[PDB]
Paper text:
The TbRRP6CAT construct crystallized in a sea urchin-like form composed of very thin needles. TbRRP6CAT crystal structure was refined at 2.4 Å resolution to final Rfactor/Rfree of 16%/22%, respectively. The model covers residues 176 to 541 and includes 185 solvent molecules. The polypeptide chain was clearly defined by the electron density, except the residues 416 to 423 that could not be modeled. TbRRP6CAT shares 41% and 40% of sequence identity with the corresponding catalytic core of the yeast and human proteins respectively and, as expected, conserves their overall architecture. The T. brucei RRP6 structure shows a closer match to the human RRP6, both proteins presenting a shorter linker and a more accessible active site. TbRRP6CAT is the first RRP6 described up to now that was crystallized with the native catalytic site DEDD-Y comprised by the residues D271, E273, D329, D397 and Y393. In the TbRRP6CAT crystal structure, these residues exhibit a configuration similar to the mutated active sites of the human and the yeast structures, even in the absence of metal ions or nucleotides. The apo TbRRP6CAT catalytic site shows only moderate movements of the side chains comparing with Mn/AMP bound Rrp6 structure, and a water molecule that is coordinated by Y393 and E273 residues could represent the hydrolytic water. The electron density map revealed the presence of a disulfide bond between the residues C496 and C515, linking α-helix 3 and the end of α-helix 4 of the HRDC domain.
Residue numbers in the entry: 176 to 415, 423 to 541
């Protein structure tokens, strides 16, 4: 990879096999250091009720035209601050996040999309990453409903990257599940707005700056229709209290905590290699486990995902073939990565030690 935004981070990411410890800010902008296995706003979220006017049967406010709708790309602190001030006047906002996971161990949030009743925003989470805590007054606000579609990943990403926590989250995917119907975003936007979403950039590289026009359009359309979908879902839940239930299930989701990826040195390799372990000798299983565990350690050290360090087929290839020279380790898996070529002797020592260990 050309891009490596982690190098620009104000604080280096801790990929160590130790529990995640949150560093978060309150609505006053006061920094706090949290505790492992403790969500720092659990007592707040459990003590906060859904705004009563948000449980009333109301008429929908249509989404605007994409042609004349204001779109703002926010990538400075002042711009982020001005946006936060705009959001503190709303009773509901639509939020989405774009993420990167290949050239990062834990992964990091790349972009944040926000739509209000009258406009759209795209926030550069990479550029203003160190200042995202300024959004806490909005995300902690009990009178502001934060609408997300399929918030399981988002809730954790907000915590991992920014120390951001949602008070009065409403998940539109949970709403669709409770109505017993298809619950993807593309489905919701098509069923209520009669618009077909792009889907082309679902797997794009969100680290690219500048963001091309088509990607800006994709990012904007992910939240632009969401408050209308929210209005439509409220009406459906109020007649056939089910609306209240969805708010209660959404609150339970906002109570989830981010947990760093865990390497179980005796389990994870089995889960990733599965039935491919069949037909391997005791020594080949030892090399399979040991190299997979090396791969994870190297990924944590280089701040890359295990797949960026070495393809899984390459782990199986070394386990099967048992290479006994540096060149044989290199030749085992044709597209030789940078991490593998530099630690070729350590991978070779794993093989040599496993065939040495038994016979």
């Amino acid at each position: 990879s050309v891009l490596r935004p982690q190098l620009t981070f104000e604080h280096p990411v801790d990929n160590s096999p130790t529990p995640f410890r949150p560093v978060y800010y309150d609505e006053k902008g006061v920094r706090h250091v949290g505790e492992p296995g403790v969500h720092p706003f659990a007592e707040r979220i459990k003590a906060v009720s859904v705004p009563s006017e948000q449980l009333l049967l109301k008429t929908e406010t249509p989404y605007l035209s994409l042609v004349t709708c204001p779109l703002t790309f926010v990538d400075t602190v002042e711009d982020l601050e001005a946006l936060v001030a705009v959001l503190l006047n709303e009773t509901e906002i639509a939020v989405d996040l774009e993420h990167h996971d290949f050239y990062s161990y834990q992964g990091f949030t790349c972009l944040m999309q926000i739509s209000t009743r009258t406009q759209d925003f795209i926030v550069d989470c990479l550029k203003v990453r160190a200042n995202m805590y300024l959004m806490a007054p909005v995300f902690l606000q009990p009178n502001i409903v934060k609408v997300f579609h399929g918030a399981r990943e988002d809730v954790r990403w907000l915590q991992k990257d920014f120390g951001l926590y949602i008070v009065n989250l409403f998940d539109t995917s949970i709403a669709l599940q409770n109505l017993h119907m298809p619950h993807s975003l593309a489905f919701a936007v098509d069923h209520f707005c009669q618009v077909k979403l792009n889907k082309k950039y679902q797997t794009a590289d969100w680290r690219v700056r500048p963001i091309p026009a088509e990607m800006v359009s994709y990012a904007q359309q992910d939240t632009h229709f969401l408050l209308y979908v929210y209005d439509r879902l409220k009406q459906l839940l109020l007649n056939c209290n089910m609306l209240l239930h969805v708010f209660q299930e959404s609150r339970l989701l906002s109570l989830e905590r981010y947990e760093k990826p865990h390497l179980d040195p005796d389990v994870t390799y089995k889960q990733a290699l599965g039935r491919s372990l069949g037909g391997l000798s005791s020594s080949q299983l030892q090399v399979a486990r040991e190299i997979f565990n090396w791969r994870d350690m190297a990924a944590r050290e280089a701040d890359d995902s295990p797949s960026a360090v070495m393809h899984i087929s390459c782990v199986l290839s070394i386990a099967t073939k048992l290479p006994t020279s540096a060149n044989e380790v290199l030749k085992c898996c044709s597209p030789v990565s940078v991490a593998v070529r530099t630690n070729v002797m350590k991978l070779l020592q794993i093989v040599k030690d496993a065939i040495g260990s038994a016979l």
